[PDB]
Design a protein around this ligand. Structure first.
Ligand SMILES: Cc1cc2nc3c(=O)[nH]c(=O)nc-3n(C[C@H](O)[C@H](O)[C@H](O)COP(=O)(O)O)c2cc1C
Ligand SMILES: Cc1cc2nc3c(=O)[nH]c(=O)nc-3n(C[C@H](O)[C@H](O)[C@H](O)COP(=O)(O)O)c2cc1C
Ligand code: NA
Ligand code: NA
Lengths: 311, 311
């Protein structure tokens, strides 16, 4: 039903992206998102080029619909992962935090849509010129690495500053979020925590369920003094890291090495980084990916009719 | 034009509140907001009971429309300020951060509408029972004291948790904000920084203009380790306070004593706390209060028509 500049740009059915997620954005879960009319995205967080090549191929076994790949600029294999996306003709590439200008042009030579994740208007506009096709404006309530501006303000300001489509991310978990994000100027939404809490997800069921029971207050920011702030589930281990950032900052940096995997794969609460957004307190049950998208789209429609009721 | 449960509850024309502000919410500026169809609110931040009584009276010299008074629960004269509001029959009382349950019942005996400011659903619901008539859900992007949840998430979650009207605050500066806040479940909006940047305001013109030139990144949070976190303009003096919170926390607490006034009244950047929300980067000019309200209402309407275009 709903169609935007983002639906045209990606030949997509719904304006819903799956956030690139390291260790959580598997080919299985991204395929279900693409089959349901959204845009799944493989999270190449801790992947070597062979891992990504195999993941790309095993996603095309599960769907012929468009999909994307997410690359962390800080990754030791960022350059190689970009070339993997090129020679596999990945339709859409997403970039994590940083400035992916050095990769725009060659990805655009190959017909790949480039959508950087930004946390400021000045960087949104900087990549817009660099050639980017769209921009994901991610507020600080999101899970994983965060910026300093909230979704409510960032999406508004970025939309007015660039002419390419803006995709709101951070805190979106239902049809009200999409409506409000669209009201703020976005033309699609990207969700992470809402798509981890799906039956197609293969995260350790502890993870899914810590999301179900988490309130909107049950997150904290770790890594802020080390320069890389990230939002995780409020847990004793996370408070230990907040302390260790001040007292022993290098021992803290090693305490997080591989901490996301012990959360994702093994559901280890004592040594895991359960990256989640504040949206977790908006999530109350595990739903199949297609049901999530259709529920969000109907509620998005009903919210617009209510907003109409005021005129 | 636009009418909600909040417009009925307050016999107000538009669903726009002026945030209670200490040293900035003067009877002059709140009168202009009430005359323009919104709800001005006197900020009794640093007022003794005589100050508030005189301020209330000198507001009724400037308008006969409804208005409110904001009380800080931490104030040495909170109890006396509440009784002043009673014997002057103030129509609406707003409470700052904390739990104002001890004041609900007696204010409700006197025909005064009680609207606490909350930063969680559990406190929103707790005051809803205590008898509150509405609730201001204030996200962490707001100016002044802040909570831990962003507007995009808090307004959504609080609206579903209570049946009394929810008023979105924090990050709202234009008609898109109102539309998105309404989409999130609110039935009115409260603004602070947008109403400081008005010609009717009497803050030192440095203050207004530091708001004009501030981006959405030009704020920081001070007072977080001392327990009372507040969002101020990103300034060297504010960074000095962030440092002094760790090293000499009691010397820091005295560094903030009266720091809001040197900002408001004297525009002292070296010793002032320029409380502002991230919305400051959405504000580009100084406008008269009535123009602000009508611009916001028209843009609110045009945003709803755009949202309609997607069906
Ligand atoms: C477990 C987890 C891992 C994530 N990993 C990445 C990542 O590797 N790269 C990236 O750019 N974003 C990453 N994100 C952020 C998401 O892509 C998305 O932008 C964010 O989840 C949106 O916020 P939400 O959780 O409120 O929906 C991650 C998020 C989560 C929850
Ligand atoms: C200078 C200033 C002073 C404020 N003082 C108070 C106060 O004394 N009590 C209170 O409850 N809120 C206070 N606030 C918060 C406002 O009432 C309002 O909720 C907030 O400004 C909304 O965020 P916004 O600036 O993005 O519009 C203050 C805000 C500012 C900017
Ligand atoms: Na939850
Ligand atoms: Na500004």
């Amino acid at each position: 039903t709903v169609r935007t500049r983002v639906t045209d740009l990606l030949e997509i059915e719904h304006p819903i992206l799956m956030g690139g997620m390291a260790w959580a954005g598997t080919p299985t879960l991204a395929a279900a998102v693409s089959e349901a009319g959204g845009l799944g995205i493989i999270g190449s967080g801790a992947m070597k080029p062979d891992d990504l090549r195999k993941a790309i191929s095993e996603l095309r076994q599960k769907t012929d619909k468009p999909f994307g790949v997410n690359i962390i600029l800080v990754s030791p294999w960022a350059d190689d992962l970009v070339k993997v996306c090129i020679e596999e003709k990945v339709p859409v590439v997403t970039f994590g935090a940083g400035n992916p200008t050095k990769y725009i042009r060659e990805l655009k030579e190959n017909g790949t849509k480039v959508i950087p994740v930004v946390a400021s208007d000045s960087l949104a506009r900087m990549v817009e010129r660099a050639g980017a096709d769209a921009v994901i404006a991610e507020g600080m309530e999101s899970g994983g690495h965060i910026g300093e501006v909230t979704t409510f303000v960032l999406v508004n300001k970025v939309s007015r500053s660039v002419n390419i489509p803006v995709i709101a991310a951070g805190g979106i978990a239902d049809g009200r979020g999409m409506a409000a994000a669209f009201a703020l100027g976005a033309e699609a939404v990207q969700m992470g925590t809402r798509f981890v809490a799906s039956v197609e997800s293969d995260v350790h069921p502890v993870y899914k369920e810590k999301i179900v029971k988490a309130s909107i207050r049950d997150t904290v920011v770790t890594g802020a003094k080390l320069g890389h702030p990230a939002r995780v589930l409020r847990t004793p281990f996370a408070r230990k890291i907040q302390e260790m950032e001040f007292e022993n900052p290098m021992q803290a940096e090693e305490m997080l090495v591989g901490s996301l995997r012990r959360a994702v794969v093994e559901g280890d609460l004592e040594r895991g980084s359960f990256m989640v957004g504040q949206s977790a307190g908006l999530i109350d049950e595990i739903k199949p990916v297609k049901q999530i998208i259709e529920d969000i789209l109907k509620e998005f429609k009903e919210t617009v009719e209510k907003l109409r009721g005021y005129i």
